[PDB]
């Protein structure tokens, strides 16, 4: 099912970027936000799919996983989903998903069939996987806040079986799921370029982006990394240079590897997540019924 | 089949009380105040009272579910991951019948909780996107076929219609086939008068936005005429009571008209109302609108 015909993007109705740092000013130039789709209900988890040169993201509430093609076309990749939220792409260019409904991590084939990868920790059902990433070694890392258990429009209500909201690492060899850290409503996550630092946001309690040291098979030196001026640092991404681009109530905030705020990119509505394409020349941002994109020069 | 709302008392709705000018309607309502039975959907539609299960069945069109309100306040998912089910109705055998934007057809559910196809084409071409339906005393299913489900991603799958008309159809209980009874402009809600001599059908285009009345005599609809216009918004879905009054949804709540088309009063609702229906005894009025399912308990 094609939900948007091929066609050019239309400028988004919002104020141009507010840039402080000269380095970010050079990166964005006079780029202006564009609207790629605006017919969803609750856009989430954008992930660039190089193998298909498609931007994958889901409409959590509409229970679909959509795919934006470079010609502007938007197709339905997965329909009538079990409330899929976050999306990611593995080393084999396969799509992996966080599903609120099945409360698990799944992986789709070519037929568009999402197969279960894990739905329990130590024999107890996960809360409701929210966002995920795939490390270079193939392990899938993800957050498990209880959001999918407290809102009917986003899953099936239920009292949690687990007494913790954790960040987990699913080994690529089939070994047991690993509880890496307990947080307060962990949400988005992303590794630093060298994977020595893992960033995870918490959106209950302190609303922030937390940093962890990834070394010797565990997470260490937990500390506050950054806070966004408005709203929640929901989903976010880190570019090859080390900058963290995070969603927020008013748009996307950009921070350097030291946590310094460099600038803000307004969006017409609350932003839920964001990611870059392969070349990192296009910044995709999800939020409400929309998929926005900022073309960098 | 999960439970989306635990059992528990309803909460009064945050809206103004009924504005009643008619004395007869003031008596019918008494001091009744609107209640909220559910507020966690996205686009509530097609409420239908299911006597056999003493449950109010309705759809969350955008959320792709058909929900069921139990009298203790519990709300369960009756049909999940639907093909954008909109209108719901109950046939003589107490089976649920549905209008599905996605499958562009009329379907019927079994005790298995599975909706099976009844009809999805006219003259070999796919229907536009069945919106609302009713079941006549003779078992025939009547429904409206506007193209809403073909021009909004959040409510179906976009496509160019195969039919060059938006019709009201009649599906015979014996041997079909579908009967094209009338063509309208975005036909939406529909309901029969108690004696079934008049069929009311609303038209809600982007040419008139109104509730239209037809004469149902012989084997066709005759004498098309304007019946009423609601003060605000669209007369989406509506129902008719045993006395002949037509209770219709609108942008500000439910409007009540007598059989002569005279406005009797207005029942404010906190948000736009999409449809409404009564329970078996017609002692409780259920109203759908956005994330909500509201109810007005009559004395
Ligand atoms: Ca589910
Ligand atoms: Ca998230
Ligand atoms: Ca990501
Ligand atoms: Ca579809
Ligand atoms: Ca309708
Ligand atoms: Ca009805």
Ligand nearest to the CA of B144: 5
Q: Does B81 contact A80 at a Cβ distance shorter than 8 Å? A: yes
Among A222, A214, A223, A211, which Cα is nearest to A257's?
A211
Of B4, B62, B153, the CB nearest to A61: B62
Distance CA A261, CA A199 (A): 16
Q: In this structure, how many other beta carbons lie within 10 angstroms of the beta carbon of residue B283?
A: 11
CB distance A272 to A248 below 8 Å = no
Q: Residue B1 class from Cβ within 10 Å (0-12 exposed, 13-18 middle, 19+ buried)?
A: exposed
- CA-CA-CA-CA dihedral for A62, A285, A213, A187, to nearest 10: -30
Radius of gyration of chain B (CA): 18
Q: E strand or H helix at B251, and its extent?
A: none
- CA-CA-CA-CA dihedral for B39, B40, B42, B44, to nearest 10: -50
Domain ranges in chain B are 1-299
Q: In this structure, how many other beta carbons lie within 10 angstroms of the beta carbon of residue B14?
A: 8
Which CATH entry fits the domain spanning A1-297: 2.120.10.30, 3.40.50.720, 2.70.98.60, 2.40.30.10? 2.120.10.30
Is A73 an 8 Å CB contact of chain B?
no
Distance CA B251, CA A176 (A): 54
Experimental determination technique = X-ray
Among B81, B103, B161, B171, which Cα is nearest to B133's?
B171
Is A62 an 8 Å CB contact of chain B?
yes
Is B4 an 8 Å CB contact of chain A?
yes
Among B130, B124, B125, which Cα is nearest to B83's?
B130
Among A135, A143, A138, A163, which Cα is nearest to A86's?
A143
Of A2, A41, A158, the CB nearest to B62: A41
Q: Does B154 contact A40 at a Cβ distance shorter than 8 Å? A: yes
Of B42, B82, B153, the CB nearest to A3: B153
Q: The dihedral of CA A253, A257, A259, A260: what is its sign? A: negative
C-alpha angle B262-B265-B268 in degrees, rounded to nearest 5: 140
Distance CA A145, CA B157 (A): 32
Is A157 an 8 Å CB contact of chain B?
yes
| CB-CB neighbors (< 8 A) of B78 in chain A | none
Q: Which residues of B43-52 are buried (b: 16+ CB within 10 A; e: fewer)?
A: bbbbbbbbee
Question: Domain B1-299 belongs to what topology?
Answer: Neuraminidase (2.120.10)
Q: Does B40 contact A80 at a Cβ distance shorter than 8 Å? A: no
Close Cβ partners of B89 (under 8 Å, ≥ 6 residues apart): B46, B48, B96, B97, B98, B133, B134, B135, B141
Measure in Å the smallest separation between the Cα of B255 and chain A Cα atoms: 29
| CB-CB neighbors (< 8 A) of B157 in chain A | 1-3, 76
Q: Which residues of A201-216 are buried (b: 16+ CB within 10 A; e: fewer)?
A: bbbeeebbbbbbebee
Q: Report the separation in Å between the CA atom of B226 and the middle of ligand 4, taken as the mean of its atom positions.
A: 35
The residues facing A107 across adjacent strands are A96, A115
Is A102 an 8 Å CB contact of chain B?
no
Q: In this structure, how many other beta carbons lie within 10 angstroms of the beta carbon of residue A10?
A: 11
Distance CA B112, CA B121 (A): 25
Comparing alpha-carbon positions, the chain B residue that sits nearest to A63 is: B63
Half-sphere exposure of B99 (CA within 13 A, CB side): 37
Q: In this structure, how many other beta carbons lie within 10 angstroms of the beta carbon of residue A161?
A: 14
Comparing alpha-carbon positions, the chain B residue that sits nearest to A81 is: B81
CB distance A62 to A81 below 8 Å = no
Distance CA B61, CA B81 (A): 10
Distance CA A191, CA A221 (A): 15
Query: Resolution of this PDB entry, in A?
Result: 1.7
- CA-CA-CA-CA dihedral for B269, B273, B276, B279, to nearest 10: -40
Q: Residue B222 class from Cβ within 10 Å (0-12 exposed, 13-18 middle, 19+ buried)?
A: exposed
Q: Report the separation in Å between the CA atom of A39 and the middle of ligand 2, taken as the mean of its atom positions.
A: 20
Distance CA B50, CA B76 (A): 14
Residue B259, both tokens: 């059989």
């Amino acid at each position: 099912c094609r939900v948007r015909p091929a066609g050019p993007a239309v400028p988004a109705d919002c104020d141009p970027p507010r840039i402080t740092h000269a380095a970010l000013a050079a990166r964005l130039g006079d780029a202006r936000l564009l609207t790629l789709y605006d017919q969803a209900t609750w856009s989430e988890g954008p992930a660039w799919w190089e193998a298909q040169r498609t931007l994958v993201w889901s409409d959590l509430v509409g229970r679909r996983v959509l795919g934006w093609r470079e010609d502007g076309t938007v197709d339905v990749l997965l329909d009538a989903t079990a409330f899929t939220n976050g999306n990611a792409v593995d080393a084999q260019q396969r799509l992996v998903h966080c599903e609120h409904g099945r409360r698990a991590i799944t992986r789709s084939d070519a037929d568009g069939q999402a197969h279960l990868l894990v739905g329990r920790y130590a024999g107890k059902r996960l809360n409701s996987p929210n966002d995920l990433i795939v490390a270079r070694d193939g392990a899938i890392w993800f957050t498990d806040p209880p959001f999918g258990l407290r809102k009917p429009s986003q899953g099936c209500p239920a009292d949690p079986e687990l007494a913790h909201h954790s960040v987990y690492r699913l080994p690529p060899d089939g070994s047991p799921l690993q509880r890496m850290a307990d947080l307060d409503h962990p949400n988005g996550l992303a590794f630093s370029p060298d994977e020595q630092t893992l960033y995870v946001s918490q959106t209950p309690g302190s609303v922030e982006i937390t940093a962890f040291a990834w070394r010797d098979g565990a997470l260490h030196d937990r500390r506050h990394f950054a806070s966004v001026p408005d709203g929640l640092p929901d989903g976010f991404c880190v570019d090859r240079g080390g900058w963290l681009w995070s969603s927020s109530g008013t748009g996307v905030c950009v921070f350097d590897s030291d946590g310094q705020l460099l600038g803000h990119i307004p969006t017409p509505g609350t932003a839920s997540n964001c990611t870059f394409d392969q070349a990192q020349q296009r910044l995709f941002i999800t939020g409400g019924p929309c998929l926005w994109m900022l073309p960098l020069p």
